[model samples]
Each structure stands twice: as structure tokens, then as C-alpha cells.
Target: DNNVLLTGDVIHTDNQLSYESAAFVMQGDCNLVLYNEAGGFQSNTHGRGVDCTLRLNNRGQLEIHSANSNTPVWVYPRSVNTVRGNYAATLGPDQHVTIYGPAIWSTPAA
Candidate 1:
């Protein structure tokens, strides 16, 4: 069994995360640092290749750049969440792609 733990800030310019797995379940309650390094998420079966229900607590933050259209950060709890950048803020399309408030617990997607 292995676990990936990354603390502090992480910058991904043009990166691709394919075939990823976790022993138990992955959980994070930290700030997700996003930098616009001219990266393209393109389009896959799931798009951007990111499929996970992220939970943003009161102290958690999911910041993104205005021009960032790469990684599709999914939101389980479709509510009043904040997706901010250095310039402004925006809400994701639908309700399963961003975190604002309470997310779905033990849902079909889970």
C-alpha cells in the first residue's frame, strides 16, 4: 500500500495524470494551488482525466486561474462553493464539478 502526500504549494504547468490509484480513499483539506502555465486539459472520456469528489471544509480552498480550463475538479456537494483566481471568481457548470457547501455522502457516484 502507498499514499501520496503533498504539502505546501504545487504548480502544474502542462501535466498529465493517467492511471492513478489509492489504497484506501484519498482525502485532502488543503489549498489547491493553480498556476496558468499555458496548460491544456484537452478532452478525455471524463475530460482532464480527473474523477474524484473533493471536499472543501471551512478552511479549505480550491483556487484556480481565470484561464485555467485544464483539470476538471469535480464537486460532490453541489452548493455554495467558491472557485476563485488571482483576478476573479466563477462557478462550475452543472453541480458535480465544484465545491461550495455540503457534498453528497455515499452517493451513486461514490
Candidate 2:
């Protein structure tokens, strides 16, 4: 319960959005990472940011940002299939991080 991050929400450095044992994190070195004791998944953006952030934007995009630039260092799920609207990223009991409402996205099996 209570494991979702809505659009316009941000996960700051070393912070996380979590549920049970699963977490979707923003690291100090700049990565959007997903994990649980059973497995791990990550967005490979380390070393590119300073005081970074992971945000689910209103355009239905998930992005990693940094103090270095206003532009995103990385974005998720490709642009072709995403739609504009409210979006939510949730850390579920199944230990997967799923984003809903652009009809949405899910972390691949690890």
C-alpha cells in the first residue's frame, strides 16, 4: 500500500519510492534504479548528474535530471507508444516497478 509516485513527483538523490521490500530509487551518482532483495534493475545514467532527480512528468514521460542541465539525461519506454495524461509509477508487491496511465510501462523481468 502507498507505493506510487504520480506525475510531477520527484525522487531526489538517495531517496526512494517503496512498497514492502521493493524500491524505485534515485541514487547520489545519478541513476533511476529499481530493486528488491530478490533482484535488481536500473536505468544506466550514473556519473552524468550532480544532485540528480527522477521525475514522472505531466507529458507521461519518466526522466532523469541533474543540476548540470535542464534537459533530461535519460527517458524511458521510447516515445512511439506513450500518450499524454496522468501517470503513476508504483512499486508493487510482486517487486516490479510499473507505470500506469499512458496505458503504461513495466520493468522487464530480471
Query: What does each candidate score in C-alpha RMSD?
Result: 14.3, 7.0
State the lDDT of candidate 2 residue by residue for 32-95, as single tens digits: 7887988789998889889999888766678998899988888886473656777888888889
Q: Candidate 1 lDDT, tens digit per residue, 1-110?
A: 11211212222333212112212122222123222222322112233222222223332343222123454354322253343322111222221122232232444754
Each model's lDDT comes to 0.26, 0.82
Clashing pairs for model 2 are none
The CA-based lDDT of model 2 is what?
Answer: 0.82
TM-score for candidate 2? 0.83
Best by lDDT: 2
Clash number for each model: 3, 0
